[PDB]
Amino acid sequence: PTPESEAFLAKKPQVPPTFDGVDYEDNKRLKQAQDAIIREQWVQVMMGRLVREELSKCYYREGVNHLEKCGKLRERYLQLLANAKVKGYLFEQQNYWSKE
Amino acid sequence: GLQHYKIAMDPALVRLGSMISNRYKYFRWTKRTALVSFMYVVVVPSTIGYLAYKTDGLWDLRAKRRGDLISER
Amino acid sequence: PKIPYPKHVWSPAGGWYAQPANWKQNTAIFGLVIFGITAMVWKYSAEHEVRHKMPEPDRFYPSRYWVKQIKDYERAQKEKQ
Amino acid sequence: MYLSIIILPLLGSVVSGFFGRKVGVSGAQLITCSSVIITTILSIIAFFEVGFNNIPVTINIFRWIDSEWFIINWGFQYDSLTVSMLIPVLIISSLVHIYSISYMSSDPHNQRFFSYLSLFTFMMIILVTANNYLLMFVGWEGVGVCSYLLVSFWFTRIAANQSSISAFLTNRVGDCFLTVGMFAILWSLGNLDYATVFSLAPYINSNVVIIIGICLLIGAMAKSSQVGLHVWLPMAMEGPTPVSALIHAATMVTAGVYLLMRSSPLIEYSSTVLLLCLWLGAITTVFSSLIGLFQQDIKKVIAYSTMSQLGMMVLSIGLSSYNIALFHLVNHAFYKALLFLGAGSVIHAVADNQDFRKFGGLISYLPLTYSVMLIASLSLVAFPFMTGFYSKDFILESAYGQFSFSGVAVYIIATIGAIFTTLYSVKVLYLTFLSNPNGPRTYYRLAIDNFFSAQAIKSYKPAHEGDFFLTLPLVILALFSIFFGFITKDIFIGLGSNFFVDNSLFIHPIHEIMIDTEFAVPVLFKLLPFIFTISFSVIALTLSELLSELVIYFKFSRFGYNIFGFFNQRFLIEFFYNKYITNLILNLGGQITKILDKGSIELFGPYGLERGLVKLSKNISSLSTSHVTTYALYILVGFILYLIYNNLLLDYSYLLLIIILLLLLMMIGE
Amino acid sequence: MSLLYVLLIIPIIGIFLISTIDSFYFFNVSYYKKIALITTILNLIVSLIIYILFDFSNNQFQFIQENLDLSFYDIYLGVDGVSIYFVLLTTIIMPIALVSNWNSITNNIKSYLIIMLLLETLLLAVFLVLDVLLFYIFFESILPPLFILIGLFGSSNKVRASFYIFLYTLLGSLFLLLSILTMSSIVGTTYFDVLLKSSFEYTTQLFLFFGIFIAFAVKTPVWGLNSWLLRAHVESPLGGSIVLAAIVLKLSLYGVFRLILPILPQASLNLTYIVYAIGAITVLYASFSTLRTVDVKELIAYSSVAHAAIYLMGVFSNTIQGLEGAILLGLAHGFVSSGLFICAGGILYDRTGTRLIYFFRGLTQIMPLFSLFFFILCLGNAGTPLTLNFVGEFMSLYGTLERLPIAGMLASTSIIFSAAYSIYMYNRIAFGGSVSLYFIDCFRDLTKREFFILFTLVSFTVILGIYPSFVLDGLHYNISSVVYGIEPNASYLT
Amino acid sequence: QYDPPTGWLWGVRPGEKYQNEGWEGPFFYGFWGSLIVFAIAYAYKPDTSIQTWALEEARRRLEAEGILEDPN
Amino acid sequence: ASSFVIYNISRPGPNGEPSSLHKWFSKISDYKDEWETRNTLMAAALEQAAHDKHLLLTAER
Amino acid sequence: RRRPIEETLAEIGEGRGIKPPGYYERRAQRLKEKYGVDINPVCADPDQ
Amino acid sequence: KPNITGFDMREFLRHTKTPTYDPWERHEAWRYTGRFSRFNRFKGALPGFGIATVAFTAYCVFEH
Numbered sequence A: 001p002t003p004e005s006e007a008f009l010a011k012k013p014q015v016p017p018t019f020d021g022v023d024y025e026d027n028k029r030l031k032q033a034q035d036a037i038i039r040e041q042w043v044q045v046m047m048g049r050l051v052r053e054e055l056s057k058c059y060y061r062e063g064v065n066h067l068e069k070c071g072k073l074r075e076r077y078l079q080l081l082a083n084a085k086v087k088g089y090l091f092e093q094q095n096y097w098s099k100e
Numbered sequence B: 001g002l003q004h005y006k007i008a009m010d011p012a013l014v015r016l017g018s019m020i021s022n023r024y025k026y027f028r029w030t031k032r033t034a035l036v037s038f039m040y041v042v043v044v045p046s047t048i049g050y051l052a053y054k055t056d057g058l059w060d061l062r063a064k065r066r067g068d069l070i071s072e073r
Numbered sequence C: 001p002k003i004p005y006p007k008h009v010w011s012p013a014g015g016w017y018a019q020p021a022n023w024k025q026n027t028a029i030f031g032l033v034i035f036g037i038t039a040m041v042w043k044y045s046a047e048h049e050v051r052h053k054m055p056e057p058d059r060f061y062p063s064r065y066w067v068k069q070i071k072d073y074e075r076a077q078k079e080k081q
Numbered sequence D: 001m002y003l004s005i006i007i008l009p010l011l012g013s014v015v016s017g018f019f020g021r022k023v024g025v026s027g028a029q030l031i032t033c034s035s036v037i038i039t040t041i042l043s044i045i046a047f048f049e050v051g052f053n054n055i056p057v058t059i060n061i062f063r064w065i066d067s068e069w070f071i072i073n074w075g076f077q078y079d080s081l082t083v084s085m086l087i088p089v090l091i092i093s094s095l096v097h098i099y100s101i102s103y104m105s106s107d108p109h110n111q112r113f114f115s116y117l118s119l120f121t122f123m124m125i126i127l128v129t130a131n132n133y134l135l136m137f138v139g140w141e142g143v144g145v146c147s148y149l150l151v152s153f154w155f156t157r158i159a160a161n162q163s164s165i166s167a168f169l170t171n172r173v174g175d176c177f178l179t180v181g182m183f184a185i186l187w188s189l190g191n192l193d194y195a196t197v198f199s200l201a202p203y204i205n206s207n208v209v210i211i212i213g214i215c216l217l218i219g220a221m222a223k224s225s226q227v228g229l230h231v232w233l234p235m236a237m238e239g240p241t242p243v244s245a246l247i248h249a250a251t252m253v254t255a256g257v258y259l260l261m262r263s264s265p266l267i268e269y270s271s272t273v274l275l276l277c278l279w280l281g282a283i284t285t286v287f288s289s290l291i292g293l294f295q296q297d298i299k300k301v302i303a304y305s306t307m308s309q310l311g312m313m314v315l316s317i318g319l320s321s322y323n324i325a326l327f328h329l330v331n332h333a334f335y336k337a338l339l340f341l342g343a344g345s346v347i348h349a350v351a352d353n354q355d356f357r358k359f360g361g362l363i364s365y366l367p368l369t370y371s372v373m374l375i376a377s378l379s380l381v382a383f384p385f386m387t388g389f390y391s392k393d394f395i396l397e398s399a400y401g402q403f404s405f406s407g408v409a410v411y412i413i414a415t416i417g418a419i420f421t422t423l424y425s426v427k428v429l430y431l432t433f434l435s436n437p438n439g440p441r442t443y444y445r446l447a448i449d450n451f452f453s454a455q456a457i458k459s460y461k462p463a464h465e466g467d468f469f470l471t472l473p474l475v476i477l478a479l480f481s482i483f484f485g486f487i488t489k490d491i492f493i494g495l496g497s498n499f500f501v502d503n504s505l506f507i508h509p510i511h512e513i514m515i516d517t518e519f520a521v522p523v524l525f526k527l528l529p530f531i532f533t534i535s536f537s538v539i540a541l542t543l544s545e546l547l548s549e550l551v552i553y554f555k556f557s558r559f560g561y562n563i564f565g566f567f568n569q570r571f572l573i574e575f576f577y578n579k580y581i582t583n584l585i586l587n588l589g590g591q592i593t594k595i596l597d598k599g600s601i602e603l604f605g606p607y608g609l610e611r612g613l614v615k616l617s618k619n620i621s622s623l624s625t626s627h628v629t630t631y632a633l634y635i636l637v638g639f640i641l642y643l644i645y646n647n648l649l650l651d652y653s654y655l656l657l658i659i660i661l662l663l664l665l666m667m668i669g670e
Numbered sequence E: 001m002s003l004l005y006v007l008l009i010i011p012i013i014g015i016f017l018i019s020t021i022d023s024f025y026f027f028n029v030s031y032y033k034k035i036a037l038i039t040t041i042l043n044l045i046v047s048l049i050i051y052i053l054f055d056f057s058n059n060q061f062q063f064i065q066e067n068l069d070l071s072f073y074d075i076y077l078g079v080d081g082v083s084i085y086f087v088l089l090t091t092i093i094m095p096i097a098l099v100s101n102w103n104s105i106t107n108n109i110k111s112y113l114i115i116m117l118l119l120e121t122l123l124l125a126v127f128l129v130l131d132v133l134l135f136y137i138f139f140e141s142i143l144p145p146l147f148i149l150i151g152l153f154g155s156s157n158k159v160r161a162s163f164y165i166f167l168y169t170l171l172g173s174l175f176l177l178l179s180i181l182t183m184s185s186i187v188g189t190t191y192f193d194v195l196l197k198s199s200f201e202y203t204t205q206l207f208l209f210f211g212i213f214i215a216f217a218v219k220t221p222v223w224g225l226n227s228w229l230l231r232a233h234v235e236s237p238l239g240g241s242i243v244l245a246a247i248v249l250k251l252s253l254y255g256v257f258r259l260i261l262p263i264l265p266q267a268s269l270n271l272t273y274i275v276y277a278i279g280a281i282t283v284l285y286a287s288f289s290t291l292r293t294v295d296v297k298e299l300i301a302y303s304s305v306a307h308a309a310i311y312l313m314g315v316f317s318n319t320i321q322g323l324e325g326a327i328l329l330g331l332a333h334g335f336v337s338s339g340l341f342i343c344a345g346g347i348l349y350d351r352t353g354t355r356l357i358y359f360f361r362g363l364t365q366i367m368p369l370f371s372l373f374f375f376i377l378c379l380g381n382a383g384t385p386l387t388l389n390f391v392g393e394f395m396s397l398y399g400t401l402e403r404l405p406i407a408g409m410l411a412s413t414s415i416i417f418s419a420a421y422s423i424y425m426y427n428r429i430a431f432g433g434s435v436s437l438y439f440i441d442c443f444r445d446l447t448k449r450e451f452f453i454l455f456t457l458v459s460f461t462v463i464l465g466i467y468p469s470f471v472l473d474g475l476h477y478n479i480s481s482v483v484y485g486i487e488p489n490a491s492y493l494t
Numbered sequence F: 001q002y003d004p005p006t007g008w009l010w011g012v013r014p015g016e017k018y019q020n021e022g023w024e025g026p027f028f029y030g031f032w033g034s035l036i037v038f039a040i041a042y043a044y045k046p047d048t049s050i051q052t053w054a055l056e057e058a059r060r061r062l063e064a065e066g067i068l069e070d071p072n
Numbered sequence G: 001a002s003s004f005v006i007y008n009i010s011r012p013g014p015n016g017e018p019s020s021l022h023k024w025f026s027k028i029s030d031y032k033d034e035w036e037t038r039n040t041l042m043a044a045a046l047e048q049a050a051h052d053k054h055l056l057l058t059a060e061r
Numbered sequence H: 001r002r003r004p005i006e007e008t009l010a011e012i013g014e015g016r017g018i019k020p021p022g023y024y025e026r027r028a029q030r031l032k033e034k035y036g037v038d039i040n041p042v043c044a045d046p047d048q
Numbered sequence I: 001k002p003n004i005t006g007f008d009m010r011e012f013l014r015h016t017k018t019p020t021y022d023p024w025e026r027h028e029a030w031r032y033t034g035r036f037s038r039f040n041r042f043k044g045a046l047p048g049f050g051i052a053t054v055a056f057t058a059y060c061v062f063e064h
């Protein structure tokens, strides 16, 4: 794919976007978990931004029959719109969800 | 302070502006002033606050499409 | 009949009946800077207008002569056989 | 080129406004007029570019607002609907500029006037060329700021300052609802770009489309002067005549119509708004046709005629035939501008008198003006084969063409509204040119007859026509008013025309009524408006010329006295707005200021705590008389109270009651 | 030393030089006024240096200094995107605030310059401190200089005006102190890094909310508690009015991003309908009574109450857009309210000695430069597009509608009512007829001083309106940290 | 018959000249000068915004899908 | 004119390759981890002192 | 510092941006019980 | 029943005519004569009709 930029190594998270198994009194590990979650939520919203830019070019390209040519892009944008918001880490940091 | 330009200060407007400034010194508690005060300070905020509580989290429009309902609750 | 007005009042738009005797020279100079400014926005347009459909070769479309996307297309299409 | 159409009117405005001293009246007029002439030529080319070739043009410059899910750019889209609007906007703006050189020649402040003209053209371009609803709102507000600046051009006149408050604030009411409507779009879809909103429109919650459509429609009343929020449009006749020709009757008033036409790929999926659009349209046509027939100001009549035509387009939008509403919009800005520039020409000739009761003859004195306004009045009534014939008469037969109760209703309502249009068109053309002279001899005293001996050199002033910069616009707009409808009937009416097949005007196959309007509608209803115009015109001419007593009988009857004053006073809508809405808000402000802020908030607060505590502290301070005998008694008293409290195991609350009792006893004097 | 401590020492160094120059020359007051102005410009150059180096996507506080020595009370300075623009606003205003009031003081000029140079340090500190007791320390250290600024250089009703501001701000801020002391008792420190990790029990949060909101409601201020501002701003000197509206009214706005959004989230969520009910009421009442105000400078002060309510509902939206719009509307209010105060308190009062709108009419005829700027600042007060005020209101209003729709619908009525009073004031002073007859002699138009501070303030309002990304790119990542909530498929990742 | 242009800018009558009050020096050189120097510096400020970082990752995720074309 | 000139000069180029000034500006404000290392030390100490303040203030009488 | 998810959902409740994993399925059950209508959003793609 | 003033609206409307004798008769006679006679006012109410009618007949005769 597109090469990973030099600016995209300095700010790339080194930790998974989670708080499970993170000692809070280790401030270094804690702030990086905060950063990891915020960066993921933001990649998700810019993923929808880019799909929306493609939708627009399919709209101005297909004109009248965009209703039968731009449906795949419409799916992806509507999926992302329901799932990506920047909600922060504060709720995530302060609650644990067992997933069981 | 600095000298200002000459203004034909109207004695009538000057005493009116003085009246507006000292007016509070003459407010009394009547049956009328209480009725207006109770309406504005209690009733309207309590009505706005009550609707704010009843409809709070009631609706969401994001990504809602046909076949879905606007009502969250 | 012209309105009497105060002559100490300075206005950027001239005031009451303001025409300088250098009006033509100043108007000429403002015309060039307008022409120069509108020349930069034109070259921006040419390189940044986006079309998803190119015009026909014989069909009247004067944009063909300055917009880069069309000029890239028509030059590429002028290579065949 | 495309981004240069946007930039030129802005630059001429800046030179005329901030640099008027350097260029002068002549230089400001030249730069302002030339920049909009050049823009007009570049826009006629863009019509061939975009529309005739089906090549939409997209250009984004930089981002305006950047957030989560919100990315609104300084971007512009040129499609078939954009170039369609640009032609009347820029042809009329160019001609009103050329016109205004003659009309505003004697005014002191020409640089400021011509600067506001170019500022309005720039804002109107921004409104129709934007990629998204939020940049279209910049032009919407911008046109509002420019209409306030031009209604209040003569700031010395108080009437003008009241009328500009009306224009500004009645349009802010519409802006509140568009802002709510754009919030709904961002809340539902995440972005308010046109491609986004229209691509996703078929799938959005049907009730979410109700909320957006109602908010878009309410905002559309204020600018399109529909009956609910229309009081401002006739008051905007305070500004100079060329302002009323472009802004108040040929461009800004149409923005509300453009908002619905642009939002066609969305509001088509809500038939609930389409009924409201349709009935909104039919009401305004009869509401304003009736009012204009009882007005005595020429500008007020031509302002109420415009709102009758704006009601026609909103009717067509709710009829779901957007190409018909766009056709009427472009055709109307040619003959409504003509009648206003022609009326402005007779106001100029007759010493700035605007009352029909003081105009008469003048047909021989202003031959070009009369014929040109006869050109305009025949297309205003949609006389066969005029420009307005193909636009207004297709709205009527399309209303009956939708074989529904609401359609047949609006056909009857609109046909009646057309009857009154023919009545006030005769009134204007008869009382200004064809009736006996009703004004002073000064307008009619020539030099062919000698009224003087030692002053023959001057002092006749007999209502002459203006100069080249005045007549030239009138001739051009006359040619449009005769032929433009025929030459463009296919681009807009057509039968399966593909001019708007880039989804600029989306009609849903469910709402198509074109084929029935071509074949189903009977010839009687198709021809019915024509007979009414020809029959009423002759009836009103006889009642105005041959039998003039009968109308005097009507207005001198108590029944007709009330009916004449009811429609002259504009349905009393102004009366009930000042008395129950405007004055109610000013009373509410006074009651909050007088009784709450300066009243109970200071009494149950700092001032009541001040006067209460100072009274209390003087009483306690009066217990201290510097008598050792009385101080000794106090120590014993305070000793016993401590002994009672810590030996009777009294509830601590019993103590606090004592303190509050004691403190409030020192609160009472004597 | 750090670069955030240089921000504080320079205004202190300027105080020293004004105090000692007479000991080297009987010195002119013009020399005292150049020292104070050069000192404020240097603070603005440092603050622009800080902004060049600042990392727009960093979750660690920047330009900090390793203390390594702990006492009971210790100054800890740091900068985050949430605070950088508040610092910049303080450093752009203070130079103009001095220039605006350059001729109007006349007596006690050293004292006047020393108080402003001292205020600049105290208001800069309140944004730079990384503890909540240190925040309170500077959020309330400004009350003694402001009591004496109004009393020494204020208008006729100055004594009562200065008593109102001090006593209301003292009373309201002592309920904040009780809440701060409780959090310190439960956690052991008020340093932000340690406090933001900690999660309080709901009941503790609901009582910490009652006490931070009481403080903020008095200092916003809300409608029934705004009497101090109607007195303070009007009777204050022009320079004090500029500081109190642009910078001091923003201390409560920036204090919600520290004291409420990150540490009391459940309380903020379950009590937002109380906040929105108050915020809605203060949008309507303030606006109705701004229409009937007859003192021009008090018409500018009342306008501030309506705007603060829009940004208060924006900070309580739990939305990224309403939170950034709240900061944008506070920055926008800082420029526009400064200009309208300069017009009312510094141009009309300078030439007439009156603030009554009865005496002003047709001022555009003799003062065409004043009317041009006055119109632009009135349009921004009305939230017209192309000004930063429109962007902040739109985002503040959208997050209000997304949180609890009904209250944002009432709050949206500010579009009709802010417009109503702004144009009505304008048409009555600039327009409204011919030049008044109460003016015996002609008034001069704008001076090169009056023109260039009005032009500077208008320039910031318009340029930032066109490209708000100058401020928006810095707040995005840091605003992301104060949102409370989860999404069902984006959270708890494995 | 247009009149000559008129007026006194800054209230300076046609006889004399503008007298520098004192503020002008620092405000034109220091206040405004700092903003132009800040403006030219801001052009070379590296872009550390979250979006420039999030766009590039987002493109690399959508490139892994048919949504965005990859140059490889 | 200056804005057009300054903007033209300060652009990066065809594909990456920042200019010398861009290199200088990014170099001076590097701070690769020195904000993190100093914040972590300070957070660790102020967290210790909170434990200490609780130990000394909640001791058995 | 952290608490059970159930503990917080008791004081604030799901909704108002607090969409815990499983919010949509529960909302369907909640909406079906109160409104008597099954939620079934439309596809938005003519293909699949 | 009649008012103290001699005003009756039925009689008022009866006199809404052109009076037989008028003291101002000659002062107003210019508005109904010359350019302002019935014919002159409507002589050119349809400006181009006369030129167009004969011109259109010339085009209409195209059979020959």
Ligand SMILES: CCCCCCCCCCCCO[C@@H]1O[C@H](CO)[C@@H](O[C@H]2O[C@H](CO)[C@@H](O)[C@H](O)[C@H]2O)[C@H](O)[C@H]1O
Pocket (backbone or CB within 6 Å): B059, B061, B069, B070, B071, D180, D183, D184, D207, D211, E401, E405, H035, H037
């Ligand atoms: C943009 C700012 C404003 C946005 C927020 C306001 C949105 C208003 C949404 C109103 C509709 C909400 O969702 C609506 O609720 C009503 C009940 O009230 C219900 O309406 C239902 O009524 C009957 C029962 O009486 C059902 O058989 C029918 O299927 C449906 O119409 C549905 O659940 C839904 O149509």
Ligand SMILES: CCCCCCCCCCCCO[C@@H]1O[C@H](CO)[C@@H](O[C@H]2O[C@H](CO)[C@@H](O)[C@H](O)[C@H]2O)[C@H](O)[C@H]1O
Pocket (backbone or CB within 6 Å): D605, D606, D607, D610, E159, E160, E163, E164, E167, E168, E171
């Ligand atoms: C929430 C409720 C309120 C919270 C707390 C706010 C309390 C504010 C109370 C301030 C009361 C006013 O305080 C008092 O005002 C009067 C003016 O009337 C001042 O009195 C002064 O002004 C008068 C004005 O005529 C002059 O004669 C003279 O300068 C002096 O006597 C007092 O020096 C001051 O102490």
Ligand SMILES: CCCCCCCCCCCCO[C@@H]1O[C@H](CO)[C@@H](O[C@H]2O[C@H](CO)[C@@H](O)[C@H](O)[C@H]2O)[C@H](O)[C@H]1O
Pocket (backbone or CB within 6 Å): B029, B041, D601, D603, D604, D605, D606, D608, D609, D611, D612, D613, D667, E224, E225
């Ligand atoms: C939005 C409202 C916010 C309010 C916040 C809290 C404000 C302070 C609350 C207490 C205010 C003091 O309230 C005030 O106390 C004194 C008591 O001597 C009274 O003051 C007055 O009492 C009577 C009037 O009834 C007078 O004859 C007397 O001269 C005077 O002392 C007022 O009756 C009361 O209004």
Ligand SMILES: CCCCCCCCCCCCO[C@@H]1O[C@H](CO)[C@@H](O[C@H]2O[C@H](CO)[C@@H](O)[C@H](O)[C@H]2O)[C@H](O)[C@H]1O
Pocket (backbone or CB within 6 Å): E019, E108, E110, E111, E112, E114, E115, E118, E144, E145, E148
């Ligand atoms: C915590 C307490 C509250 C702190 C609030 C901040 C207060 C700041 C006050 C500034 C310091 C005092 O300011 C001081 O004013 C006196 C006025 O008598 C000046 O003293 C001099 O003033 C003028 C100068 O021409 C002389 O006419 C006068 O005779 C002389 O006393 C000092 O030169 C100045 O330094």
